Amino acid sequence: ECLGFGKGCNPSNDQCCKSSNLVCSRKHAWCKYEI
Prior knowledge:
Blueprint lengths: L21 E3 L6 E3 L2
Antiparallel strand pairs: 1-2
Protein name: Mu-theraphotoxin-Hhn1b 1
Subunit structure: Monomer.
Family: Belongs to the neurotoxin 10 (Hwtx-1) family. 22 (Htx-4) subfamily.
């Protein structure tokens, strides 16, 4: 029930897959990978 890495999402309401530590970015409005 989440978006994969690189999937376009919202920075304020990020809903990426937390299992792989994925967060939404505000510059490209997609799922970015931290580290």
